[model samples]
Target chain A: IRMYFEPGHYTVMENCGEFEVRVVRRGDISTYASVEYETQDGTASAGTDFVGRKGLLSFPPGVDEQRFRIEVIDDDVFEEDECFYIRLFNPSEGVKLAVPMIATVMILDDDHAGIFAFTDSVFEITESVGRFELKVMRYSGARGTVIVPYWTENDTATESKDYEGARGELVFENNESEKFIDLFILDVSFKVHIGEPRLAPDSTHYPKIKEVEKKPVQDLTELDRILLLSKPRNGELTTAYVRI
Target chain B: IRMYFEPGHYTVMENCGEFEVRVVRRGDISTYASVEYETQDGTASAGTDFVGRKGLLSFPPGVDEQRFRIEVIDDDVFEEDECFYIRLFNPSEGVKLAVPMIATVMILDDDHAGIFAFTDSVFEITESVGRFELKVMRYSGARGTVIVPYWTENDTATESKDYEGARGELVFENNESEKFIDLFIYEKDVSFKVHIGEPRLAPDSTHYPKIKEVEKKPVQDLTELDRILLLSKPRNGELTTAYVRIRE
Candidate 1:
């Protein structure tokens, strides 16, 4: 009986997880034949980059092949592709080695090869301050310079009066996790001469008129209309208040 | 039949060269029983700092053990002790796996103990009058400050008259390969003394000197002296002799 590795060589990404290598036997063997196989160091490391394996594979009677596995380890370090060898030896019971007794396994680098999303699903900040920061984050394998374009949409606040409109991009370098955008909230105070205004009791906004008590006031509490809005660059647009 | 490692854990210095992990089997069996073993990454890496290995160890009737070696690679960078694991599994017929199926190998740092020596046997100098350099080099695990003490002894030239008699040190920082000693070859209008002087090289430490004395020290050890003399050459154009006859 002759034993050899199928396909001779294999290539995979470091993030490919795990793969199997098969040892096949040719010619019908009346009795069971076993062969030993193992992995040795090459450019790729056994423990750090991939799990090194070795075992005795048995081809019992009707079975023509047996397989072993090499598990790839994923890491954050950016590096080059490396290789290792899987060799077969020490055959048992009338088993002869084949020409391709050894196979090479190549591990491709995957540190900077995938798309990234914001690390935080949702972020929060108060609008009362003159400025607020909106942060955008990236996931693993995020590489190169990434430009996350963002703009301020209409919420309850006015574009030019209440809060200044902003639209640009947040730049992120390779492997960078977070980037931010600046939002400017209008901080001007003015006295309003009202003709006729509707006032509510349970308003949840700050009173803009002077000589008023310090208390929680709702949007358009003593005005005719109100609007509120917020949205992300690649996310959903949201509004907390209705316009009248 | 049973298969297992002799020691559950092993710790060694990085400069220990090589180490072995033995897989032993108990009780004699009529049939062959083999088990698979491999190394998994822990704090240490394979290939970079250690030569990783895996193989099937078979116990064929009366044979009780087999061993796989993991070679330690000494380096110069200072780091904490790192570890990696070796595991055994998938036994063949009639073989029982031992309790400690896995072993931890810890690589202790030996960056401070490697040797140092002169990079070259002989250095050449031209009488251009500016500063020239003589270098001292080191091999693997060469860390910390290394002082290579050297002195100029009389050879074909006089010490003070031809060149100044010198005795000092060449210092190397951590992981540094080469350090230089400034040499000033006197320039003159007439035919200057173009003499050669043998520089005596010595190591401050006994162990460093022992390895340097051997011509065939290992690549990881200190190198022997390559040359003894620092020869002088004319600055430019050509020189006739002590009689000052110009030759192009």
Candidate 2:
């Protein structure tokens, strides 16, 4: 007897509910034949990522194909693709399991981790109140918790003597689209930014930074892939330091 | 100390999710007290019509009101309204079960058995094909299993010699909105209809057979209440009263 998954791979959306796996039996159907099936984890974890299932599939006379479904757990967290495996084992006598004994189901993510940036690249505030409130907006896709680093830098105005420079990370919980940071008005903005770094305009990395700035984070994902593959420090600042 | 359901009755559509019932505990709340509650069948059976529940409702110190819900099973069956009872009993000592020892929940049916009528009150066919096809549509709410009786009649065409006369019952399962009846033309033109025993008082089962029982009763004898009850259900008249006539 021969038994295996006809299709070796399956893909589904995060909240699609369930993935059905069909198994084909190749042998004499003169007598009753049955097989056991179960799901296991690959990149995805059982219970947390999906509900595991194990059951017997029977192939009585005139029947050659049988199917079962694995229930997927849905979450709003923005994530990458995850997967799990399903296998056929313990065939009822006279049956032998063949190659391609395992199959995988890919869960495509539906939410976004978000793009972090200051509400505005530039802020103009008069020195009146005791403090100034600045905000970082997490827009586009707000599915997971994230953090955007913020710190003050010296421009024409020097830190401490002219105003106080503050540094901290802004944490955004799931679905939290906005986070605020405050600066004292003894206070004022020389410049506030995302990542920490100040490479001179004429520096060797200057052109790349200018090119990166020319567009709105050109292919935020792919540029990131190539930048990371090419080098570091500049790559780090490439995703950072949008301050003014 | 007394305990009972604040409201005595609840009515909901058959598929109306769930029913919320509140139980009030009176007197003292300095100590913890509890009561046992269970659901029993009235006209509505448990398991088949609803999910039965039995549990302890706690009245913790400083707390006087608690609640629970009964789940109703949603079905496509068009049926008469049904009811079930939930009772608050076996109260903690010093606490007494009061009036309305039991409360009833009435389930309003949303689906209907439907009115049986021909797609049209008229029909015309050629003297060609060996068989002629006809249809009966069950409208309003196509739910539950029902059987509609249909038979043959003669108009300008004669039975047997000119065509064939047929009589049988058409069965409709739940969600089935249409059923077709075939007549062997034997090269003919004949009239056909739904419902047996044509009192000819608009037979196509526009009101089922019960209309006869009502039509037989002279309005002169009906009381005001009976008049109102009888006046109810135009649901029947809103449909056809046809004994369908066929023409060449």
Candidate 3:
């Protein structure tokens, strides 16, 4: 299960912690067979984790059971709403197949309205230390076109998910606060940190040889030579040459 | 915890097992130091005769300390509005103070409302036994007192706490057709058996009152002649009673 922290004024943070989930099977009336699971992953592996905390849990590998309880101990709150999910990979044989059901987002207000919106619909997108701009695009509007443009890396260059429609300028309006739109953006982009050959053993020449072991290398292997290419006029690749 | 069962209604059942009910102390959630109780009473303790096989369990002691997950496995298409009661004994040390803070009925549908009804609300001047009928106090009114009349078998009959008020009936109108006032009278009455007994044996009772040399006083003693009182059926004595009064 995914948990979202609602820090007032709208900021999101994610963290991970350790927890235990177990199952309790009801044999007859007032009789229960409780099995505490201490495995690292929530699976019925017959390894050493199930043997008194050191081995994996041993169980009938194909039973979809419901006598389960997930004991989650995070930073502070031990058990919270929707912090973890119990996924039973195997199916049960005896009784009717039943899993734990949960309800979410139940409002207790009297209005009983489906959608609620505030006046302002703006959000802020800051590019701190990284040359990244916030862009918006409708899923079905174009093949890979970005409809709204916010900020850019520089004046001499343009980057787009699409070839033609993705070029747009950041709209900075007066009297409007700098904020992101209060809309659920389905798609998001992130710049991932990839192989840094300077710290690794033998990856310097790995990027040069395409299909090192019949694997296709990234086209941006030349980026290893231009890690400090902050401005288009920084190095041998001039700003005017790379803009077009 | 105590559970109630209906005829055709399917209900989740538990077995006789030993488990501990501990309270998760606030600010010390990792440690559970308070142990409420440990028991091995379940459907198996209901009876070894017939009802034991049918899976009928009485509410065990120390119920108030723990929260039970009661799943209804009934055949009837009960609407979300249907409501029921679960009555059990609550020791003073149990978590009765935490009732207002904990969420038991809140997890249910929002339309549902529940309240705890005490057995003292509708009893009589007699002792606890079978054939007890709830007397309709008001002739024709919205609601009134329910008085149950029962007699004492033994000379000493304190307020019966043997079955934790399990002998009382749930008086409600049958929703079969149009709503009509009706009552389900039990002639045999609700009684309890020694469903599960784990007693340790004492070697001899004669070792205590040692008037003779050994415990062989049977040869020399007769409490001179045991008196026999003339009595046919039950002779009425000081009948103690307790109950709670309800309106509707």
Candidate 4:
């Protein structure tokens, strides 16, 4: 009997009320079943067509929180070769008050299209510590591709608080594919503003502060792949950002 | 030795916020108290005071359920010209809902005033069965003479719903001064209400359905004098009636 083993495995941590999921599976259905579980910080992000064990799996029943498990019978293993693609699912009503839990999917080292492998991992449930920070100011950078949205509250005693538009400069070059791109981009920064900031310059940020309409928070429960298809060719990079 | 014996009493009834006094020393204090504590079938009635038994009388604690007792200190007996005043204290707030364990007062033939010296005392408590039936209508007395100054939700609704220029009448009499006065009495009924035919237009003593105004019922504790004063003067005597309707 020839047996195939893979190190791709994942589990769900918290009981997020009720949830739904869509995934791609391989192997025989009659013999294998899918098992879904979670760990503390982040669990192994892998999905397989059939049931099997992976490397160094350490999970406490309540700690790792299992959602679903699909069993695989030995006879179904060699029937076919299939790729497993797992995507996060969102319930119809969506997540409530809790801040979205971030799930990271590293592009890894494969430049060409290939199956992204998983690793035996440990998870830790923790509060976000303001992990990433970016500084923005007036500067010069490449034209048109630069964008940033900003916001400010107005408490001016008088009227007529005018504001200046953010400006920056960056030079571009062509790579082997001959696509124009910005090089010598030592510094990258842009103002993120929704409306123009001023004492009475026709707009203010109070609207954004008060409503979810002005700024829709990201839904971490549904993770979408960030596609970089627009990257200019020719050993060149198009540094794109928005000030919204 | 001429000695005066003054006996005072207080009662607490169930589901009632105020008490009523069945008897009192004189018409001075209990006069006002009784008028305020008497049981009004549809309105408010006061209580009266009592000049109780004299001479070290064993006034046991008020009856547990139906009655209570008082301690009256009187040493002298059989003395002429011996007098003491008594009063029934019924708090202003609980004037409406109090029904003491005992609602009737045993009127002594020699203690009260007027020609009714030997007459049975009338208590203003709501009684389903008794010697005589009391018909407590709204206070249709002199405008300010028998007034319930306290705020009543029922009264508020009446005033709020009363149209402008609603005609009302009141009956006023002061036996102490031998005075009988009538005024345009603004009719304020508690929860009790009934329909009455207009005079001349339709007047055959028609019986109208009893209607009621919702109110915050407060049981009041009252003394003897309060009960007496409340029922002292009725709106109408044996068909003597006053009339008032809500303002248009």
Model 3 chain B lowest lDDT segment of ten: B226-235
TM-score of the first chain of model 3 = 0.20
Clashes of 4: 106
lDDT of 2 by residue, A1-244 (tens): 7777777568877777887788877877666888887775555777767887778898887787787777788874445566556766778876765545556567775555455555543355554555667777654445444556677766435677555668887766655767777675442225566652233344343365456434333233443323322211111111111112
TM-score of chain A of each: 0.49, 0.48, 0.20, 0.16
B86 Cα displacement, candidate 2 (Å): 1.1
Error of 2 at A240 (Å): 78
Q: Of the candidates shown, which would achieve the greatest TM-score relative to the real structure?
A: 1
Model 2 lDDT per residue over B1-248, tens place: 88777877788877777778988888777778889888866557888778888999988887888888789999644355566767667888867866555666778765665565655433545555557667767665554456666677654456775468878767766567777776776322344433322112224434445434654444334454443333222222111322233333
Question: Scored by CA lDDT, what does every candidate get?
Answer: 0.52, 0.59, 0.20, 0.20
Candidate 1 C-alpha lDDT tens digits along B1-248: 67777876788988777788888877766666788877765546777677777777777766777877778887644454566767677888677765556676878775543344443222333344444455444454444445555555443245454455656755555446555555544322211122112222325422344333442322223221221100110011111000111111
lDDT of 1 by residue, A148-212 (tens): 65565553346677666677655555546566656666511111010111122222221321212
- Per-residue lDDT of A1-244 in model 3, one digit per residue for the tens? 1111111011111122222343323332232222222322221112311212322222343332323222222221111111111222222232211122110111011111011111211122232232322222211111111112222222112234311122223221211212222111111121111111111122232233222212222222323212211101111100011111
Fnat for each predicted structure, in order = 0.00, 0.00, 0.00, 0.00
Best by lDDT: 2
Q: What is the DockQ of each candidate?
A: 0.00, 0.01, 0.00, 0.01
Q: Candidate 4, A124: how far from true, in Å?
A: 29
Off by over 4 Å in 2: A1-244, B113-235, B238-248
